[PDB]
Amino acid sequence: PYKHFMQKEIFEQPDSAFNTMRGRIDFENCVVTLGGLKSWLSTIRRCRRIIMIACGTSYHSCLATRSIFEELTEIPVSVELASDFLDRRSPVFRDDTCVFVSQSGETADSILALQYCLERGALTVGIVNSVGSSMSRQTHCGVHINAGPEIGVASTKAYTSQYIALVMFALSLSNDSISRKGRHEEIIKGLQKIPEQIKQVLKLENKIKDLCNSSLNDQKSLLLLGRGYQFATALEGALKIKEISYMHSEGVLAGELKHGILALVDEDLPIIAFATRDSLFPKVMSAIEQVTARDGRPIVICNEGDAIISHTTLEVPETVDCLQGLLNVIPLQLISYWLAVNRGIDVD
Amino acid sequence: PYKHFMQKEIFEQPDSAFNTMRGRIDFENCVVTLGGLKSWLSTIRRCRRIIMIACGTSYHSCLATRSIFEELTEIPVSVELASDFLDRRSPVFRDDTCVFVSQSGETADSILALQYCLERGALTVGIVNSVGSSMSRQTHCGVHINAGPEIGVASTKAYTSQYIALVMFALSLSNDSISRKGRHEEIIKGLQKIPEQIKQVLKLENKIKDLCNSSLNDQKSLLLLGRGYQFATALEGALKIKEISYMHSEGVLAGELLPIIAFATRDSLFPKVMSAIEQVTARDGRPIVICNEGDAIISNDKVHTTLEVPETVDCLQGLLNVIPLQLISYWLAVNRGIDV
Amino acid sequence: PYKHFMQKEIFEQPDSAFNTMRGRIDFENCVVTLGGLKSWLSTIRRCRRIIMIACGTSYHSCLATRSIFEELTEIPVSVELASDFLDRRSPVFRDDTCVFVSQSGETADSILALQYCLERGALTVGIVNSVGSSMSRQTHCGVHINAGPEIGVASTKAYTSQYIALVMFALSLSNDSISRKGRHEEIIKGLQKIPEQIKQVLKLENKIKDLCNSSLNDQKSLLLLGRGYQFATALEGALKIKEISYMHSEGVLAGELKHGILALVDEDLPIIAFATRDSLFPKVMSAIEQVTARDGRPIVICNEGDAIISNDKVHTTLEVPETVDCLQGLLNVIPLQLISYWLAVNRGIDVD
Amino acid sequence: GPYKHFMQKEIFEQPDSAFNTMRGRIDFENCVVTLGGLKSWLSTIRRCRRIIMIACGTSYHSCLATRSIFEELTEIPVSVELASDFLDRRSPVFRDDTCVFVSQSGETADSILALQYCLERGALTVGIVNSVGSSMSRQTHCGVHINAGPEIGVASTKAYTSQYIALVMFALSLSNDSISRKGRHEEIIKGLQKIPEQIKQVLKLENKIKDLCNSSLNDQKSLLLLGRGYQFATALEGALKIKEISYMHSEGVLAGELLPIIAFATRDSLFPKVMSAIEQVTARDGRPIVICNEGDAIIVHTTLEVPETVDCLQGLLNVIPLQLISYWLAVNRGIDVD
Ligand SMILES: CC(=O)N[C@H]1[C@@H](OP(=O)(O)OP(=O)(O)OC[C@H]2O[C@@H](n3ccc(=O)[nH]c3=O)[C@H](O)[C@@H]2O)O[C@H](CO)[C@@H](O)[C@@H]1O
Ligand SMILES: CC(=O)N[C@H]1[C@@H](OP(=O)(O)OP(=O)(O)OC[C@H]2O[C@@H](n3ccc(=O)[nH]c3=O)[C@H](O)[C@@H]2O)O[C@H](CO)[C@@H](O)[C@@H]1O
Ligand SMILES: CC(=O)N[C@H]1[C@@H](OP(=O)(O)OP(=O)(O)OC[C@H]2O[C@@H](n3ccc(=O)[nH]c3=O)[C@H](O)[C@@H]2O)O[C@H](CO)[C@@H](O)[C@@H]1O
Ligand SMILES: CC(=O)N[C@H]1[C@@H](OP(=O)(O)OP(=O)(O)OC[C@H]2O[C@@H](n3ccc(=O)[nH]c3=O)[C@H](O)[C@@H]2O)O[C@H](CO)[C@@H](O)[C@@H]1O
Ligand SMILES: N[C@H](CO)[C@@H](O)[C@H](O)[C@H](O)COP(=O)(O)O
Ligand SMILES: N[C@H](CO)[C@@H](O)[C@H](O)[C@H](O)COP(=O)(O)O
Ligand SMILES: N[C@H](CO)[C@@H](O)[C@H](O)[C@H](O)COP(=O)(O)O
Ligand SMILES: N[C@H](CO)[C@@H](O)[C@H](O)[C@H](O)COP(=O)(O)O
Numbered sequence A: 001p002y003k004h005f006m007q008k009e010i011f012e013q014p015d016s017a018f019n020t021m022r023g024r025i026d027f028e029n030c031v032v033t034l035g036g037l038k039s040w041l042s043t044i045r046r047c048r049r050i051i052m053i054a055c056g057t058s059y060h061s062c063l064a065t066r067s068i069f070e071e072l073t074e075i076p077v078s079v080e081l082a083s084d085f086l087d088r089r090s091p092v093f094r095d096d097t098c099v100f101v102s103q104s105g106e107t108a109d110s111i112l113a114l115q116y117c118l119e120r121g122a123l124t125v126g127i128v129n130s131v132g133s134s135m136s137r138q139t140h141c142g143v144h145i146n147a148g149p150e151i152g153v154a155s156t157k158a159y160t161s162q163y164i165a166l167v168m169f170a171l172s173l174s175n176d177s178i179s180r181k182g183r184h185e186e187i188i189k190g191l192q193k194i195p196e197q198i199k200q201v202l203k204l205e206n207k208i209k210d211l212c213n214s215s216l217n218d219q220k221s222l223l224l225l226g227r228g229y230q231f232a233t234a235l236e237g238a239l240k241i242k243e244i245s246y247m248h249s250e251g252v253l254a255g256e257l258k259h260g261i262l263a264l265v266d267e268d269l270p271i272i273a274f275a276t277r278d279s280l281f282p283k284v285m286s287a288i289e290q291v292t293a294r295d296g297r298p299i300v301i302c303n304e305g306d307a308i309i310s311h312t313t314l315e316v317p318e319t320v321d322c323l324q325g326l327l328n329v330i331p332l333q334l335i336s337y338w339l340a341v342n343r344g345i346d347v348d
Numbered sequence B: 001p002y003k004h005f006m007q008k009e010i011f012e013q014p015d016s017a018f019n020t021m022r023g024r025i026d027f028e029n030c031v032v033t034l035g036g037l038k039s040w041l042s043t044i045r046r047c048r049r050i051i052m053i054a055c056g057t058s059y060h061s062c063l064a065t066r067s068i069f070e071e072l073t074e075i076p077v078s079v080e081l082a083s084d085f086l087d088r089r090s091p092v093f094r095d096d097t098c099v100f101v102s103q104s105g106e107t108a109d110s111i112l113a114l115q116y117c118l119e120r121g122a123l124t125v126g127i128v129n130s131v132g133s134s135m136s137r138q139t140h141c142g143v144h145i146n147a148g149p150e151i152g153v154a155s156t157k158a159y160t161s162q163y164i165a166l167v168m169f170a171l172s173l174s175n176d177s178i179s180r181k182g183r184h185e186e187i188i189k190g191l192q193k194i195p196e197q198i199k200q201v202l203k204l205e206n207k208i209k210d211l212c213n214s215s216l217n218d219q220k221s222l223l224l225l226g227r228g229y230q231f232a233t234a235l236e237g238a239l240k241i242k243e244i245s246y247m248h249s250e251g252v253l254a255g256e257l258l259p260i261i262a263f264a265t266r267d268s269l270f271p272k273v274m275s276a277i278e279q280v281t282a283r284d285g286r287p288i289v290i291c292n293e294g295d296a297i298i299s300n301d302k303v304h305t306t307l308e309v310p311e312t313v314d315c316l317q318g319l320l321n322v323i324p325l326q327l328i329s330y331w332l333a334v335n336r337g338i339d340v
Numbered sequence C: 001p002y003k004h005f006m007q008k009e010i011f012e013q014p015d016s017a018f019n020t021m022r023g024r025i026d027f028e029n030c031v032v033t034l035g036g037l038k039s040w041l042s043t044i045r046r047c048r049r050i051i052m053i054a055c056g057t058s059y060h061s062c063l064a065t066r067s068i069f070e071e072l073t074e075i076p077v078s079v080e081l082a083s084d085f086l087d088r089r090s091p092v093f094r095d096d097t098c099v100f101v102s103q104s105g106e107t108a109d110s111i112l113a114l115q116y117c118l119e120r121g122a123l124t125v126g127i128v129n130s131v132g133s134s135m136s137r138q139t140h141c142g143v144h145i146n147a148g149p150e151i152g153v154a155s156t157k158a159y160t161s162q163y164i165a166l167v168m169f170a171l172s173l174s175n176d177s178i179s180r181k182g183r184h185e186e187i188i189k190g191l192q193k194i195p196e197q198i199k200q201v202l203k204l205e206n207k208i209k210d211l212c213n214s215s216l217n218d219q220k221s222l223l224l225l226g227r228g229y230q231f232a233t234a235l236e237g238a239l240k241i242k243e244i245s246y247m248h249s250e251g252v253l254a255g256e257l258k259h260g261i262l263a264l265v266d267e268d269l270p271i272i273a274f275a276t277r278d279s280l281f282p283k284v285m286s287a288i289e290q291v292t293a294r295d296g297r298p299i300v301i302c303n304e305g306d307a308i309i310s311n312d313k314v315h316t317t318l319e320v321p322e323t324v325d326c327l328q329g330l331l332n333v334i335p336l337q338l339i340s341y342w343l344a345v346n347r348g349i350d351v352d
Numbered sequence D: 001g002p003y004k005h006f007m008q009k010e011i012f013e014q015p016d017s018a019f020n021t022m023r024g025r026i027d028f029e030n031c032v033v034t035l036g037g038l039k040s041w042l043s044t045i046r047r048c049r050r051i052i053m054i055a056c057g058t059s060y061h062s063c064l065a066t067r068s069i070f071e072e073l074t075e076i077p078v079s080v081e082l083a084s085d086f087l088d089r090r091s092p093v094f095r096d097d098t099c100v101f102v103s104q105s106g107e108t109a110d111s112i113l114a115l116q117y118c119l120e121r122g123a124l125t126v127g128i129v130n131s132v133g134s135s136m137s138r139q140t141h142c143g144v145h146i147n148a149g150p151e152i153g154v155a156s157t158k159a160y161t162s163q164y165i166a167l168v169m170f171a172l173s174l175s176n177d178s179i180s181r182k183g184r185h186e187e188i189i190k191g192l193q194k195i196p197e198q199i200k201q202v203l204k205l206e207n208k209i210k211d212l213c214n215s216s217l218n219d220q221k222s223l224l225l226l227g228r229g230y231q232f233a234t235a236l237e238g239a240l241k242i243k244e245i246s247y248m249h250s251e252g253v254l255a256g257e258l259l260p261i262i263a264f265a266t267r268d269s270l271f272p273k274v275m276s277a278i279e280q281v282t283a284r285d286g287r288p289i290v291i292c293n294e295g296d297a298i299i300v301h302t303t304l305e306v307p308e309t310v311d312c313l314q315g316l317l318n319v320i321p322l323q324l325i326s327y328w329l330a331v332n333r334g335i336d337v338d
């Protein structure tokens, strides 16, 4: 019933999200159990630091979850792009836990980075979609995300499923803390509602098809503004637009520069801003204002009922702050898909 | 005899680079001595990790020197933008060494980041230009970079002076290792020549003026391609272009996925850089290539502009590579009638 | 009504044990709150390792609680004798948490070790009885143990109060762990019973007095056998006998050597063995059997009701209430304090 | 050979076993230590939260004798555990611990149980073992075979001094990248070069020690050994030897912290508290046996003079008269030490 595998995969997300969590979360007692990590957790905690290493959209899923790992675990977490990690010859030692995120489990730069960490004595952990792929075999332990196959060239359901797996991994690491208990529960109860909220967000597709037809198809570039939890989503949205739609795009840290890209925008170029409550910073408001003043008409992704400015609005349900990126990425997936098909591009 | 403070400050770099090292490097014996830090070095090293925290060009100087800190010290080093560091409520603890880089020592997010780290019991180190500014006073210890006052609106000499001070800090932290003695000597001997090499690089100004006179100056954006040590230079070039020239620009990790400037000096001449360049020459895209004197990155059968710079030690190459970008950003602004 | 400050201080222990815990343990909700440390706990935890540093009986209170600190916190814990720490010039750094235990807060070697750690940038924590003493002032934070003044020359109540404060510190450090909750609850409920159990143990005095009036008073040496939690108690018992009774004494790790001191002892050499359930190891039973095999007549400190040596073999028992394993040392040391005291009295020594 | 007992042979063999332990491993001219068993593991061993040395009996003493030099040269926390007590406390161990197991036999039950405990917990394990291919040798990740040759006497003698040498070489190897350590490294390496000949010289104290053991010293019930600092381990090991071989009670005491008396008063460990303890003894006219450096007048007493070596190597020489005293006290008391 679907034009492309990509469209099918986007629409499959309530199912792929549920299947990633299946058998792993007791939503009643609020307990997370990851069979592949279970016996390794005590060891994983006992590291100097966690280094998340990935390429492309998997690198984004790491940026999207870095804050929650830091918050729940109080272990240092850094996020490396695999190729740049190898280019710097970054030192790795026995006391590092290196977490490798990959949909295919076969990306050359990820495998090379893995081999480098393995040779240095680090503990290695895979978060991988292709069961028994090279990355799954070669990591010491890990989690198969169970999202099913992706045929679309750009990753959609693997991003949301990876992000969920990474959240479950952070919850697992912090499952012995009294002080964390209430935050754990909050997140777990939030995760329970994600698949249905994704169903809801997918109902934006008509408004999105209209927006592309009326304001976007014709455009050479588009700028995405985000901060905090939503900066990763701005980078991922930009990558989707670039890969699928063959249009220029850039994710920008909102309001970081006064005199930067926004002091230098046309009253014409399309701008999408993340203004959901989890990442509604004064710098995001100033960025939006600097657009409206200039007579740009921003596209605002925000939570249902919110009045961000006096523009096009795409409303999404409100979830737990660290989960909001799971909902906010979906309209960007749909935008990139429709922009591409409306240009005769094959997305499969 | 300069039109603007920015032009004066760019041309001051052989002197500011020299002044940053003055009294701190024994070039004969290859000994670095940072008075502000030396009784603190054993404690700085005894940390779980180093967090470099800064904004803007100062954040770039951190990115430009991260690899040499990690290489020489084998201490984990992460680099944070002060505002994003705060947005995440990044936990920090007694075992962190937090290194704050700031020309002014007054930038609001850098200050708030500092106070946050201090409240959490971290050791704090300032790399600061304004002596006795907030950041200078409130950090436990530090190095004044001694670049002199910087009055241009965009940072030029403070970037190259911050980068030098950071390399001296990394050398200081690693001064007890026999295995890294040769690498220390290499870098220190390389640093001695940087001021005279900056003088050489400033000799590109005429070629750069000729470039900024061309229809380059009516472009809406400029892309900069770099990788490894030169990725920070690409990000900093793009900031200068946006800040000064009012032209859009983006620094791109070369080959990871309209005028184009590509960094192709030997320190950062990766296969991915070459393939990115080839992609541009395949569509006869006429790239501007920053490369080392005498290296033909692109054949004569493709139109391209070359800006040759001296070869230095790999982790010092960014000190020279940033200079043409400073000059391009300045002359683009002048050609566009911008009072820099 | 007491003959000496030392006697009074021994018999004051139900009250001092209570006083150390007072206002710090919610026994109903099982919460420990140490005001002196509360806001420093997250920082104390964030260390490479804990170094306990002390002299004499205060050093023994560290040995007596090392295992529970290790168990509850999973942070490396080492215990140093202050003078030896200084002799080795042991390297200390910013990532070390240094814990100084001292009754007086004025012992020279403890103060020198503190200054050494302070100047090296380590976090320092005092567990001190004398309020506002040098160690109390100079440590970053700490717990005043609240045992009251100790006038006896040998430490009695400050030992049990230090030991309790250290257990409370260990509980405070591990109070965020779900997996530790049952162990915390077990220990805290145990602590609540310690003051009344100390009172029970003190009822042993008549038996001990009779024993000190025995063939025991005549001999020149006494060996103590202990393992595990009770090794510290053997060392502290030997120190008390040496310091107070002026008799030679040695605390011996039980059954460690098959042909060590026990293969050499005279039939009539006085030997005290700790055989309470918390430290009743096969090696302890081995050592005890080696003693009785040679016709030795050991004194057995064991839990109420337990038969460690057959009634067929001559031996003395001093029975003590059973408590939580890591708290048993609080009860087991009491008879040694009383033995050292009555051995001294009977030899004319003035213990004050 | 011309020796009455294996134990006597093995004592007198120490110049040779000390040399053999070092052979092929120390370049004395260039001051370079190379331990083949460790070469590829050193960078990893250094990257640990801490080092735990774990051993029994005399091997536990060799850890105490070298703890200080490990701490000094490496700035890694070093703790020393008796294997049985380590197990008794169920002391936690983790991935980030380097656990160093010292054993002559490589077969001691508590040492093997402690090794398996550490292995299951994911610690890096390092063996310092005399019997090649023994349980401890095979099952540690990496290690150094001490090359002392077979030891048949039941009190360890040559295995103590060879374990102690092996451990010092291990400490030197861990700190071989430090510029600030270089002078100290060279001092200790030049010191080690002279140890075998210095042990030859100390063995010439034998007649003086026989004279001492012919006296009423052999009729005593207890012998107290006083030491501090580097020489505390020596005092413990001396006491163990007297108990194991001589069947006389002995205790190693930390000098001046609180009957024949031996006091270690060599310059490496000549603390105020040692001098105080010695004065206490002479004040009551107790007649101490003093082990001190050649030419030193420490203070009726007996003096056993030993050559001066580097502070952290002095234990290697000081232990030798204790081994001889234990052996001749046994012979005088009619005990077959074999
Ligand atoms: C492969 C397999 O039989 N998985 C079963 C396992 O799933 P479970 O979810 O427990 O484990 P995973 O499928 O995630 O992992 C399988 C194994 O692969 C390792 N691993 C995984 C990913 C990675 O990147 N690297 C890596 O080493 C894990 O540590 C584990 O040993 O128990 C479930 C019942 O609860 C079953 O329904 C699953 O079919
Ligand atoms: C400011 C000052 O009087 N500097 C003097 C210092 O230079 P020197 O180069 O030794 O020291 P710096 O100027 O770098 O540092 C001055 C002091 O400020 C501290 N600090 C510095 C920067 C920072 O961000 N945070 C921070 O805490 C340093 O730890 C130091 O205590 O000794 C020289 C003599 O050898 C004199 O010529 C300089 O005039
Ligand atoms: C001595 C004192 O005023 N104690 C008061 C403190 O008891 P509380 O039990 O809260 O505190 P302690 O007496 O244990 O500690 C007093 C102070 O001294 C510090 N410290 C203590 C011991 C040490 O060795 N080193 C050290 O630095 C502590 O960190 C603290 O700042 O607050 C209570 C209010 O609830 C009062 O009833 C107590 O009278
Ligand atoms: C046993 C062996 O083959 N030794 C050879 C090795 O000596 P070399 O001195 O190089 O090595 P060792 O004999 O010390 O150790 C041999 C191996 O056993 C390991 N190990 C050792 C002790 C221990 O307790 N645990 C442990 O795992 C080492 O890591 C190494 O892999 O090369 C020399 C030539 O260069 C040969 O003369 C020796 O015959
Ligand atoms: N086109 C996709 C992104 O949607 C690619 O960029 C991948 O994300 C990138 O190659 C990493 O792939 P991986 O997740 O299989 O390791
Ligand atoms: N305009 C400059 C860039 O050249 C700014 O981005 C500064 O670099 C940034 O504000 C940081 O300032 P600082 O170095 O004084 O803390
Ligand atoms: N005589 C007593 C023991 O009872 C002494 O050993 C002290 O315990 C020792 O001096 C330590 O004193 P302190 O706890 O005041 O620091
Ligand atoms: N009798 C000897 C000591 O002289 C024993 O104490 C051993 O030292 C002890 O059994 C350890 O043996 P090991 O070094 O073979 O592991």
Ligand code: NA
Binding pocket: A135, A136, A137, A138, A139, A140, A141, A142
């Ligand atoms: Na695997």
Ligand code: NA
Binding pocket: B135, B136, B137, B138, B139, B140, B141, B142
């Ligand atoms: Na300062």
Ligand code: NA
Binding pocket: C135, C136, C137, C138, C139, C140, C141, C142
């Ligand atoms: Na204090």
Ligand code: NA
Binding pocket: D136, D137, D138, D139, D140, D141, D142, D143
């Ligand atoms: Na082995």
